[PDB]
């Protein structure tokens, strides 16, 4: 999630996922943030406050 990505909207003949800003590098214009994009985040990230122990 370390980008300022934004979607381009419709009207350009490509799908609606948000995309990296800039120029001059192959990262520019690729998908970001989504769980199905290369280098994205997990749909439901794992958290530290799940229950690890149980009571007998």
């Amino acid at each position: 999630m370390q980008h300022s990505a934004e979607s381009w909207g419709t009207g350009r003949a490509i799908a609606r996922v948000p995309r990296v800003k800039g120029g001059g590098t192959r990262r520019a214009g690729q998908g970001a943030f989504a769980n199905f994009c290369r280098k994205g985040r997990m749909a439901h990230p794992t958290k530290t406050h799940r229950r690890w122990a149980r009571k007998v």
């Binding site: 229950r51 122990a53 009571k55």
Partner: protein, 203 residues
């Protein structure tokens, strides 16, 4: 005692003698500038009850403050939000004007430390206050254990953090059930504890 007689006189502000001395000395202050030095105390016995001594390393300054409501600067009153937040003209400041005067005198002498302050007069446009300050680098101060506490590191710029008597007055501290919103030490640390959820490992 000698201090009993001076106390009874200074309490009767506005009685035929104090009304003469107030007009004569406030005419002096109006000819000096925004913040200036005085050599002896104006009200000698009120200054000694607030902590002043006749010793090297004690200093007195007088400062004025401008007397009214606080300012909000939007071009023609546009505040860029909802109508409950669009008031311009009758908003009152959060601190007292006696604490605003300490911030003026504490920047002018950045090498000293503020101790207390008190009222000394008034105008149509200004009020005047008398600030007591101490030299944290003099050996006369660093050597005696009645004022020595102010020379350590948590004691720098007490009047910027709300630790003098005038600025303490606005924090909302006290005893009993009429002061529930400051338990823990201040308003913000009461907020934080009550906006936290604590869980045990075994739950």
């Amino acid at each position: 005692g000698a201090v009993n007689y001076l106390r009874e006189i200074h309490r009767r502000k506005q009685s035929d003698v104090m009304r003469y001395l107030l007009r004569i000395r406030v005419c002096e202050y109006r000819q000096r500038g925004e913040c200036f030095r005085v050599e002896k105390p104006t009200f000698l016995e009120r200054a000694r009850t607030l902590g002043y001594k006749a010793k090297q390393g004690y200093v007195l300054y007088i400062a004025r403050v401008k007397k009214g409501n606080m300012k909000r600067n939007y071009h023609n009153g546009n505040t860029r939000g909802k109508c409950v937040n669009a008031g311009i003209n009758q908003i009152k400041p959060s601190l007292r004007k006696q604490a605003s005067a300490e911030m003026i005198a504490g920047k002018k002498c950045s090498n000293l430390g503020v101790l207390n302050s008190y009222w000394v007069g008034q105008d149509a446009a200004y009020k005047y206050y008398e600030v007591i300050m101490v030299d944290r680098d003099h050996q006369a101060i660093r050597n005696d254990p009645k004022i020595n506490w102010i020379c350590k590191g948590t004691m720098k710029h007490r009047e910027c953090r709300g630790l003098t008597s005038a600025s303490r007055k606005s924090r909302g501290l006290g005893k009993g059930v009429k002061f529930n919103k400051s338990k823990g030490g201040s308003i913000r640390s009461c907020w934080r504890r009550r906006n936290t959820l604590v869980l045990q490992k075994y739950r």
